[PDB]
Design a protein around this ligand. Structure first.
Ligand SMILES: [Sm+3]
Lengths: 180, 359
């Protein structure tokens, strides 16, 4: 899965998140088309409940969340990210970091992330949080679990004056945010 | 809500700054393709589609023509809309198509066999967007990707590492896939040049004949044959019946800011709004980033949202999603009242919420 954002000189904005599901998907190319085929059928409930069950012509549920935040009536933050169910909390943190903590788009992007998806019952964290903070969380009853980096945000913040501010996730080597 | 910050020289991390247009993506080459499209006079949608096609060549890991995704579009005039181009299960798909003999799911079948594929929507989604909200002809936004496929590009660290790590598990197990991504018995390495002649042909035909090439033409034939000869389900009818769908975005208000995101079949949009609704009852700014209290509150709010997600979400065309109740602020408040900043509630004691009083 991968996400990209775009903002033009007129102030139009687009956020796109698309995928093959897993990396390279099935790894199967369609004959001599040179086109890799997705393995999206795995995103259906194999056996959640019946809501996301495999059915003909049905679209499997996805966590992909291209998102746009508006401030003072104007497009202000354009973001999104890959990461399966972690997409929800990654995008959530981009929004909270920007609105509540007043972080610029790069600061918000480079900040460490945490995540809790109910089951497993564990507060998953990236490297970067204070040992003192983590101990407090455990004292609160949280089961802290240090794991792999989460997501790949590609975002653009728009100033009311038209100035554009962007940031590519450090978690993805070779990525890039550029403009003119 | 405190004052915002676009960035000052004294910060540790600095955003990239631009006065006219901007593109942010996982790949340098694709980003540059988008920027060139904007410089040439294209609008955000035009550039987005060009980037989407470029990534399908330079980022085979996820960029694609054989997959699907979502797009959020907001015009300078305020009109905000969502494009759903998620894959559709084949017509011959069945509820237990992935169960072995014992009745247990066979991951191998839903991940590596020809049965794991849904009908691709990317090409349809991009054309729906380009035709209605773009300003350039498809051949113009596809050309950059076409050249990259035909003339090739240098394999960087990202592609090299991904081919080696994830590619090794599936690509070499298919002759046509191996012929493209493998070299001298090993995955392509950084510095190697990746030329994709067959993909270039597909791109050239799409640019020339439009999306029908993929859904009703040669490419369609190629996908069907691949399936028919290897126990796959995607047929030419499935491809001819595919349709990208423009849907109303899911939205909410957080401290005066309006948030717009993907609606079902996506689960993210609804729950991002729901969680924000919950967090709005707290003075997050006060606790601050990286504080145990801020993390406790958000961790707890997330539990409830994910619980609801496991129960009420699905393809809106097949199941009725209680989005109104899930994004209702009274409901969020009832959840916020259950959060103890000093003591977490075990997930075992948390169940999908009762939405009746909010519908
Ligand atoms: Sm998935």
């Amino acid at each position: 899965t991968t996400h990209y954002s775009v903002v033009d000189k007129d102030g139009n904005a687009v956020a796109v998140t698309y995928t093959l599901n897993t990396t390279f998907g099935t790894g199967i190319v369609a004959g001599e088309s040179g086109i890799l085929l997705n393995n999206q059928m795995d995103d259906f409930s194999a056996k959640g409940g019946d809501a996301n069950a495999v059915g003909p012509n049905k679209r499997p549920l996805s966590s992909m969340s291209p998102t746009i935040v508006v401030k003072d009536g104007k497009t202000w933050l354009v973001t999104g990210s890959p990461g399966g169910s972690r997409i929800i909390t990654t995008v959530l943190q981009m929004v909270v970091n920007s609105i509540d903590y007043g972080l610029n788009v790069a600061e918000a992007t480079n900040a460490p992330r945490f995540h809790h998806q109910w089951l497993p019952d564990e507060l998953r964290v990236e490297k970067g949080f204070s040992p003192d903070t983590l101990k407090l969380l455990e004292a609160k009853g949280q089961k802290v679990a240090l794991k792999e980096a989460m997501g790949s945000t590609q975002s653009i913040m728009v100033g009311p004056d038209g100035e554009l501010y962007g940031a590519s996730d450090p978690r993805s080597v070779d990525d890039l945010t550029a403009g003119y | 809500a405190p004052p915002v910050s676009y960035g000052v020289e004294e910060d540790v991390f600095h955003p990239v700054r631009a006065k006219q247009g901007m593109v942010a993506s996982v790949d340098a080459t694709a980003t540059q393709v988008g920027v060139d499209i904007l410089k040439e006079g294209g609008n955000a949608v035009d550039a987005a589609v060009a980037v989407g096609y470029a990534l399908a060549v330079t980022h085979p890991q996820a960029g694609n023509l054989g997959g699907g995704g979502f797009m959020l579009i907001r015009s300078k005039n305020g009109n905000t809309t969502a494009i759903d181009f998620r894959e559709m299960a084949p017509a011959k798909a069945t509820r237990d198509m992935f169960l072995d003999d014992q009745g247990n799911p066979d991951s191998k079948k839903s991940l590596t066999s020809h049965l794991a594929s849904g009908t691709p929507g990317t090409v349809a989604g991009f054309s729906l967007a380009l035709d209605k909200y773009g300003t350039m002809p498809l051949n113009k936004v596809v050309q950059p990707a076409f050249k990259l496929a035909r003339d090739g590009f240098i394999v960087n660290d990202a592609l090299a590492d991904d081919l080696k790590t994830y590619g090794s598990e599936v690509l070499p197990n298919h002759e046509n896939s191996k012929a493209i991504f493998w070299k001298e018995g090993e995955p392509l390495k950084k510095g190697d040049t990746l030329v994709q002649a067959n993909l270039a042909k597909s791109l050239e035909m799409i640019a020339e004949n439009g999306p029908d090439e993929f859904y009703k033409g040669t490419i369609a034939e190629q996908i069907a044959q691949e399936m028919q000869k290897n126990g796959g389900l995607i047929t030419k009818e499935d491809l001819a019946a595919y349709k990208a769908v423009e849907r109303t975005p899911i939205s909410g208000d957080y401290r005066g800011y309006q948030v717009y995101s993907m609606p079902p079949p996506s689960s993210g949009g609804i729950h991002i709004v729901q969680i924000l609704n919950i967090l709005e009852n707290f003075d997050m700014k006060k606790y601050g980033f990286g504080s145990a209290d801020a993390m406790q509150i958000m961790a707890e709010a997330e539990k409830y949202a994910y619980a609801d997600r496991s129960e009420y979400l699905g393809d809106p065309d097949f199941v009725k999603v209680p989005w109104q109740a899930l994004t209702n602020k009274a409901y969020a408040k009832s959840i916020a009242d259950q959060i103890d900043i000093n003591k977490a509630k075990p997930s075992s004691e948390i169940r999908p919420g009762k939405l009746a009083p909010y519908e």
